[PDB]
Amino acid sequence: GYFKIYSKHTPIDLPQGFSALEPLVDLPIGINITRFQTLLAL
Amino acid sequence: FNATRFASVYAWNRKRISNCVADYSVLYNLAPFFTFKCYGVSPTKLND
Amino acid sequence: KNKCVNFNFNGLKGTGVLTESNKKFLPFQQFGRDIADTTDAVRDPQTL
Amino acid sequence: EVQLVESGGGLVQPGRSLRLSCAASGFTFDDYAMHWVRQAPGKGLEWVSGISWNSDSIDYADSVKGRFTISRDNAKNSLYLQMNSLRAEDTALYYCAKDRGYEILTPASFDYWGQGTLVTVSS
Amino acid sequence: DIQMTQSPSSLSASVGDRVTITCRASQSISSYLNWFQHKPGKAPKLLIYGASSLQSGVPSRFSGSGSGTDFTLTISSLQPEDFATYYCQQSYSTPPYTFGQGTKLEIK
């Protein structure tokens, strides 16, 4: 029931390297998720 | 606990508690709560 | 600090000497362990 | 500390109809059942009628069936009692009490009361 | 149906006495009775809900007891503002919330 969001920002296909993502935010949501879609700006 | 009405067992209601100090002596010292038996933690230790 | 005291941090009891630590915890990392899986570094809830 | 203010009392001739309102302010009203009860000038208390938290379960006294009607407006936190076809034996003092629970016919009884309003049915 | 009887009607005592009042039922109601105090000049107030459960905010001097067909209320201190009429009400039988007769209390 918790939505964990991990984030990492880097100054640069996928580049070759190793970078651990720190735990950013926990969300006490407790819902079901089966699909998703990103959001852009025109 | 002092809620006037409860929900049915199939649609059981869930409430999340956080960011507060919890005192369990309020629950413990009341006679009507007859069935108070706990799993994995001794009730007397809840206060600490 | 700097003497053998019985400590209790958030229900975690123990006996030891609390000293300054140079370890750089992640801003989120709360507790700490070692190679031997023993709690050797901790963060005070009152003062970060 | 809860308040129960009642109005609509007075004196009417037999066979007429009058209207009572009872407003509460000291507690949450959307989840409590309410009752109207009667006290004769020279006798004890008697129950009259009752409505639940919502207008689903409604009860009237046997002696007053088919004559009196109770209503409830949750938005303004009040209930109402319309008295119809009054007789000479309905000149008592009526109290507007609140039930502890939410249903109508429960072992739970009236918790808080309010000062009764006096009505008279005579010429 | 159900019938409630008040064995005493008027009782006299002093400020330093202990008084008891009994309410009898026609048949068993399973300890589902309530005790109400009614001052002659203001709105009546509940003293006891259930057989022996004391309502919040009232002095602990009053004590209710009894189960089955008979029930009893007792005052141990008799403070000088305890003058009122006491009623016993059942909430278990098919007749909804039928009340018993009054029980006058006077101090002398």
Added chain:
Amino acid sequence: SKFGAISSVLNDIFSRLDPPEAEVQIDRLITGRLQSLQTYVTQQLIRAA
């Protein structure tokens, strides 16, 4: 290794449980650690020989 107990820390068992079953948990942990230490000593004796 918890060795079958609810936790591998004695202080957690003390602060979380009453004596009646804290005793059982502590007994389980004690017998497990004793077995491990016995195995270590037996291997040490063989290697010493």
